[PDB]
A paper describes a structure:
The most widespread of these mechanisms employs a “controller” (C) protein encoded by a gene downstream of its own promoter, and usually co-transcribed with the endonuclease (R) gene as a single transcriptional unit. The C-protein binds at various sites within the C/R promoter to regulate transcription of its own gene and the associated endonuclease gene. Unusually, in the RM system [name], the C-protein also represses the MTase (M) gene by binding to the promoter at the transcriptional start site, denoted OM where the C/R genes and the M gene are transcribed convergently from different promoters. Flexibility in this loop is very important for DNA sequence recognition, as it has been observed in the nucleoprotein structures to adopt different conformations depending on which operator site the protein is bound to.
Numbering used by the authors:
A (entry chain A), B (entry chain B): 3 to 79
């Protein structure tokens, strides 16, 4: 699907712009590394609560995240 | 948790703007009515795939959804 693949793509794009490894995010987001890897490959089973934990771990506001998700969808869907 | 409470607010807001019942949304979204009620009652997490199916069931684009969520967070914190 287009949404979960865009959510993952935006998580990875921000994590690398902040210079972070999957381990680093895992530790800051309170989710296991395998979880992070999994979501970055497919975000279908990401919950909203976890996505919030990920945003806190990237240190990115929800609003910014959503604005990048919309920009990605609009420009590339 | 904060994100989920605004997501739950936006779902309910759109559902009622559209004049749809919870039963109607449940059927169109592939999610139990018990599920929908819990999501709106903040007593229940939600996956992105679930949120996707809800948007389809509301017949709103993800972009419009997320823009409404951003306005809600921004104007009302």
């Amino acid at each position: 699907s287009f949404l979960l693949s865009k959510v993952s793509f935006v998580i990875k794009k921000i994590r690398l712009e902040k210079g972070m490894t999957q381990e680093d995010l895992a530790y800051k987001s309170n989710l296991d590394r395998t979880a992070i890897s999994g979501i970055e490959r497919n975000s279908r089973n990401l919950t909203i609560k976890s996505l919030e934990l990920i945003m806190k771990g990237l240190e990115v506001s929800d609003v910014v995240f959503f604005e990048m998700l919309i920009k990605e969808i609009l420009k590339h869907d």
